[PDB]
């Protein structure tokens, strides 16, 4: 159910859906079309809706190797290692609960998911997501490992748990493809399947009705026959691509994994400065670091206050007014004072 969350997956049997972005040239009912990308975090981790249940077993068990792939026979395997998220490169995977797959990646304009878990060789689709490097801090360096800083930043807290936002699961759909019908040599001899083979043919025996047996409506042609597939024990995610074959909207709720929370990030503070103060004005020599927005606000009354995202080893003429200035140069605190 929730402790193994794959039972909350198993309430609505998930499957791949129609995305027109289907492998750099085509589209299809992809097994891993990106249902939606959700990344609201200063921690720099993307989260995506995946076509499979990454975490549900073939019987909907908590399976570390198992990402439940999709087929016509919907019970499809997927190896837990075969999932590759190439956004602008092979980004770092972070977690997968249900369709919620979250992880880090480099800068980029798009993201591609690749997996071949029932099929051979890595079915992969690529959508657009302008993954910027929007990090906070007076500097601009994307490397945690300095002994330099700690600041508040939001990030997707990766605890696997029940729910804060439950995506819907309803409407096992029909679609514009029901090819399980057959031509029995003068009739529409439709093969029986595991579900309601709705033999919606032009007339005869084929006009309506789920087929638990091979429904042979004699005196039918191929065009005289029309397929139908009605199933059960399922729930569609949103029908985003999703030809909405739900007769009535009503779903269950499956909690979105990795609830975001406030953590701390490590910002590297660069080499501070050289100060040479003269009559009424000073000079601040900054060697270059990872690019740092140095701010000089005139400490006093309503005064000139400028900034510069400095990226060289250059000397900013710190206007050192009689009231004084405020030197805020990067990750260091706002060290500003009066005439020296």
């Amino acid at each position: 159910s929730t402790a193994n969350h794959f039972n909350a997956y198993k309430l609505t049997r998930p499957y791949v859906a129609y995305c027109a972005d289907c492998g750099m040239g085509h589209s299809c009912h992809s097994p891993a079309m990106i249902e939606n990308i959700q990344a609201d975090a200063t921690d720099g981790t993307l989260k995506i809706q995946f076509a499979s249940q990454i975490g549900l077993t073939k019987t909907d068990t908590h399976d570390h190797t198992k990402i439940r792939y999709a087929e016509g026979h919907d019970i499809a395997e997927a190896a837990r290692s075969t999932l590759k998220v190439h956004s602008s490169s092979e980004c770092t995977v972070t977690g997968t609960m249900g369709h919620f797959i979250l992880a880090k990646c480099p800068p980029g304009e798009r993201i591609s998911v690749s997996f071949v878990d029932s099929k051979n060789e890595h079915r992969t689709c690529r959508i657009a997501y302008h993954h910027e490097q929007r990090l906070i801090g007076r500097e601009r360096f994307t490397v945690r490992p300095h002994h330099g800083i700690e600041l508040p930043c939001t990030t997707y807290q990766l605890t696997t748990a029940e729910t804060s936002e439950e995506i819907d699961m309803h409407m096992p759909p029909d679609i514009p493809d029901r090819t399980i019908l057959s031509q029995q040599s003068g009739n529409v001899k439709i093969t029986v399947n595991g579900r309601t083979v709705r033999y919606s043919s032009s007339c005869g025996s084929q006009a309506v009705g789920t087929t638990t047996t091979d429904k042979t409506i004699n005196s039918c042609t191929v065009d005289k026959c029309q397929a139908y597939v009605t199933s059960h024990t399922k729930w569609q995610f949103n029908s985003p691509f999703v030809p909405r074959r739900m007769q009535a909207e009503r779903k269950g709720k499956v909690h979105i994994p990795f609830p975001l929370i406030n953590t701390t990030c490590r910002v590297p503070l660069a080499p501070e400065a050289l100060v040479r103060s003269g009559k009424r004005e000073a000079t601040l020599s900054l060697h270059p670091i990872h690019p740092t927005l140095l701010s000089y606000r005139t400490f006093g009354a309503e005064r000139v206050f400028d900034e510069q995202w400095i990226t060289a080893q250059t000397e900013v003429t710190i206007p050192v007014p009689v009231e004084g200035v405020e030197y805020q140069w990067g990750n260091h605190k706002p060290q500003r004072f009066v005439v020296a």
Binding site: H146, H147, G148, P271, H287, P288, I289, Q313
Partner: protein
């Protein structure tokens, strides 16, 4: 060089230095005076001599 009180538990001995002035003065070095020499003499330095000094 300036050391700092590091992150406890681990041995992180943070020691903040200046930028590398040899590298910052080599890379980001100015216009090479061998070019732009007046009189048009090619300043070549096995020994630093301005051969072909016009």
């Amino acid at each position: 060089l300036k050391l700092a009180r590091p992150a406890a538990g681990n041995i992180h001995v943070p020691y903040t230095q200046t930028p590398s002035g040899f590298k910052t003065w080599q890379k980001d070095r100015d216009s090479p005076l061998n070019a732009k020499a007046p009189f048009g003499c090619i300043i070549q330095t096995n020994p630093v001599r301005a051969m072909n000094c016009a």
